[PDB]
Amino acid sequence: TKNDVKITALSTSESQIISHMLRLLIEHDTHGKIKPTLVNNLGSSTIQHNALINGDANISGVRYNGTDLTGALKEAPIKDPKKAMIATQQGFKKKFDQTFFDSYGFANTYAFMVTKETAKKYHLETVSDLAKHSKDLRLGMDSSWMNGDGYEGFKKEYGFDFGTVRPMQIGLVYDALNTEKLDVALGYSTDGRIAAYDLKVLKDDKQFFPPYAASAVATNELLRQHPELKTTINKLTGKISTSEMQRLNYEADGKGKEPAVVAEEFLKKHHYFD
Numbered sequence: 001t002k003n004d005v006k007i008t009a010l011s012t013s014e015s016q017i018i019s020h021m022l023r024l025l026i027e028h029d030t031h032g033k034i035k036p037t038l039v040n041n042l043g044s045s046t047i048q049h050n051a052l053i054n055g056d057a058n059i060s061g062v063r064y065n066g067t068d069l070t071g072a073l074k075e076a077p078i079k080d081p082k083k084a085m086i087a088t089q090q091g092f093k094k095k096f097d098q099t100f101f102d103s104y105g106f107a108n109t110y111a112f113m114v115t116k117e118t119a120k121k122y123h124l125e126t127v128s129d130l131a132k133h134s135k136d137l138r139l140g141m142d143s144s145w146m147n148g149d150g151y152e153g154f155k156k157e158y159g160f161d162f163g164t165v166r167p168m169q170i171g172l173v174y175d176a177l178n179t180e181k182l183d184v185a186l187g188y189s190t191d192g193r194i195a196a197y198d199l200k201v202l203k204d205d206k207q208f209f210p211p212y213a214a215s216a217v218a219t220n221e222l223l224r225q226h227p228e229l230k231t232t233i234n235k236l237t238g239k240i241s242t243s244e245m246q247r248l249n250y251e252a253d254g255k256g257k258e259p260a261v262v263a264e265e266f267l268k269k270h271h272y273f274d
Contacts (some may be wrong), residue, residue, distance in 0.1 A: 001226045005036035006057040008048040013252035014108065014190060014245065016040070016259035017266075019061030022216060022233065024264055028272045029232045046071060048217075052098065058222040059233075063100065064108055066210040068217075072096070077210040084211045092217065099223060101215040101233055106242040109212040110145070111189040112202045118183055119200035126205040127158060130184065134160045140177070141186040142170035149208075157208045174199070189242060192250030201242075214245075235273040 005026060009019035016038075023036040039057045042048055045064070049072045051057040065088040069075050073091040078084035085103070092100040112127050119125075122133050130137070139162040145151060146167050155161050166182065173185035174193035187194070189201055216233050223230050240248070251262040267273075 002033040007059040008057045009040045011041045020260040020263035058219045060217040063217045064212040066212040079207040081211045097220045102237045103213040104240040105238040106245040108190045113199045126203045131160045137183040138164040139184045140166045140173045140182040143167040190245040192253040195246040195250040196254045
């Protein structure tokens with residue numbers, strides 16, 4: 001139709017890519033009648049949430065369900081993917097009059113990861129596959145993770161521990177793995193370096209971590225004013241696998257492209273999902 005759309009974005013390339021993708025897709029579907037702008041460089045999803053609640057914006061480009069379920073919704077974590085998403089969507093509707101969309105198709109979670117040579121050597125697919133070997137392996141993790149859903153809880157849940165642990169900056173675990181300073185890293189599952197270095201992300205077979213499925217959020221006030229936008233936003237539902245988000249992040253962080261350029265190239269490649 002024609003009116004006022006503002007999309008919150010974090011300072012992460014991931015948020016900026018998907019926020020620009022929504023901006024461009026809305027421009028496309030509305031033939032320039034709606035030209036959204038970004039409320040960019042926000043520090044956290046608390047800041048994103050507060051913007052929507054305060055009327056400072058009406059779309060969040062990307063929100064993660066496990067974050068918003070225990071954060072904004074103030075609820076207990078749910079481990080099962082389907083029931084966690086249902087609880088998140090019901091909560092956003094009833095507490096905040098917002099639609100938390102079905103997922104883009106990726107999750108951005110802490111995940112254990114190894115190089116391709118290490119995954120081959122030890123036949124690794126799941127976190128449990130590490131059990132026999134972990135005593136001889138070097139683990140790198142974010143320093144904030146040393147401390148009930150950190151390393152102690154993981155050791156209790158999974159039933160094994162590592163020969164060496166190295167608490168460090170999460171941003172540096174990918175290169176430390178690539179350079180063989182680590183054998184295993186607890187990294188973020190969509191980091192572009194997973195694509196750049198062909199790293200193998202292991203399945204959390206015991207669901208030690210809750211889901212962090214990524215979705216758009218829009219206020220229902222906006223969706224009531226412009227019903228067409230719900231159809232627009234839903235065009236992206238399921239269209240970005242975890243592997244694809246890794247690739248897109250690589251385009252921005254490894255190849256140095258603007259998130260707006262990465263978003264547009266992706267949209268053109270898929271004919272704007274028309």
